[PDB]
Design an enzyme around this catalytic site. Structure first.
Site, PDB file in Angstrom:
ATOM      1  N   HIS A  73      -3.154  -1.795  -6.767  1.00  0.00           N
ATOM      2  CA  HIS A  73      -2.401  -0.610  -6.355  1.00  0.00           C
ATOM      3  C   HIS A  73      -2.995   0.147  -7.129  1.00  0.00           C
ATOM      4  O   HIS A  73      -4.154   0.139  -7.015  1.00  0.00           O
ATOM      5  CB  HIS A  73      -0.806  -0.577  -7.139  1.00  0.00           C
ATOM      6  N   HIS A  75      -2.985   2.931  -9.188  1.00  0.00           N
ATOM      7  CA  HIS A  75      -2.724   3.819 -10.613  1.00  0.00           C
ATOM      8  C   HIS A  75      -3.966   3.798 -11.024  1.00  0.00           C
ATOM      9  O   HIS A  75      -5.078   1.957 -10.744  1.00  0.00           O
ATOM     10  CB  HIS A  75      -1.931   2.845 -11.366  1.00  0.00           C
ATOM     11  N   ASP A  77      -5.045   2.366 -14.397  1.00  0.00           N
ATOM     12  CA  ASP A  77      -5.796   0.961 -14.436  1.00  0.00           C
ATOM     13  C   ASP A  77      -6.413  -0.048 -13.464  1.00  0.00           C
ATOM     14  O   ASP A  77      -6.919  -1.189 -13.634  1.00  0.00           O
ATOM     15  CB  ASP A  77      -4.398   0.072 -15.205  1.00  0.00           C
ATOM     16  N   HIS A 136       7.490  -1.970  -9.459  1.00  0.00           N
ATOM     17  CA  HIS A 136       6.637  -0.714  -9.772  1.00  0.00           C
ATOM     18  C   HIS A 136       5.597   0.255  -9.216  1.00  0.00           C
ATOM     19  O   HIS A 136       5.543   1.447 -10.004  1.00  0.00           O
ATOM     20  CB  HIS A 136       4.832  -1.711 -10.772  1.00  0.00           C
ATOM     21  N   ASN A 167       6.476   2.176 -16.841  1.00  0.00           N
ATOM     22  CA  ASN A 167       6.165   3.504 -16.519  1.00  0.00           C
ATOM     23  C   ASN A 167       6.857   3.294 -15.023  1.00  0.00           C
ATOM     24  O   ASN A 167       6.253   2.448 -13.941  1.00  0.00           O
ATOM     25  CB  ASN A 167       4.713   3.611 -16.584  1.00  0.00           C
TER      26      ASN A 167
HETATM   27 ZN   LIG Z   1       0.758   1.025 -12.344  1.00  0.00          ZN
HETATM   28 ZN   LIG Z   2      -0.368  -1.436 -14.896  1.00  0.00          ZN
END
Ligand SMILES: [Zn+2]
Ligand SMILES: [Zn+2]
Length: 214
Positions: A73, A75, A77, A136, A167
């Site tokens: 994904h 994000h 990280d 998520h 989150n």
């Molecule tokens: Zn994420």
């Molecule tokens: Zn994550």
């Protein structure tokens, strides 16, 4: 077998002859796939510093190059080491949606080549990518290793130690349950589940994530 970097920043842990979990410091997990054509990672790391250090550690140990990375994904990280991948000529696979979000958020673009189901083969190692729906994040995918029945859940899947969803600013908490059900339907016999963060488990992690969503 568990091997650490210079500090405790980066750890790799063997799941089987050809599959390791990588973990970097909040902890974050991915896989290292030791294939006959090179090393393949499922997910990068937080930033370019950690990504470089991960690539170097595994290249030295396995005595082959990192050729490909699957980004699960958009994000930090997951995509934070993208610059490093691109400048080293490491192919960075993702869905189109992940690429678009990556670009929207100022990151260099991965390939956008993954579909809802994509089957890849790196030497002898088979890798299936699956977009189960939103959870998520809008774009989250899982990765399945059909030769080992190992599922890389990513941040769609919470570890036992996780007591809440974490989150949720980019999450879809109504759809996340259906998405997990789609994974459970697709993969009925799972040997190991690797969550985005925390300890490796089994299908219980998917059931745990459903409970956290109630
Ligand atoms: Zn994420
Ligand atoms: Zn994550």
């Amino acid at each position: 077998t568990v091997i650490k970097n210079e500090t405790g920043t980066i750890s790799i842990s063997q799941l089987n002859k050809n599959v390791w979990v990588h973990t970097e410091l909040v902890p974050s997990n991915g896989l290292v796939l030791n294939t006959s054509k090179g090393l393949v990672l499922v997910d990068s790391s937080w930033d370019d510093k950690l990504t470089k250090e991960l690539i170097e550690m595994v290249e030295k140990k396995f005595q082959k190059r990192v050729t490909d990375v699957i980004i699960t994904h958009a994000h930090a990280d997951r995509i934070g080491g993208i610059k490093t991948l691109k400048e080293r000529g490491i192919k960075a696979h993702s869905t189109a949606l992940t690429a678009e979000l990556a670009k929207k958020n100022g990151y260099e673009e991965p390939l956008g080549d993954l579909q809802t189901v994509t089957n890849l083969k790196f030497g002898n190692m088979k890798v299936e990518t699956f977009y189960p729906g939103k959870g998520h994040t809008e774009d989250n995918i899982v990765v399945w290793l059909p030769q080992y029945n190992i599922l890389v859940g990513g941040c769609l899947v919470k570890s036992t130690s996780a007591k809440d969803l974490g989150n949720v600013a980019d999450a879809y908490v109504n759809e996340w349950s259906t998405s997990i059900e789609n994974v459970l339907k697709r993969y009925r016999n799972i040997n190991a589940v690797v969550p985005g963060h925390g300890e490796v488990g089994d299908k219980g992690l998917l059931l745990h994530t459903l409970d956290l969503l109630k």
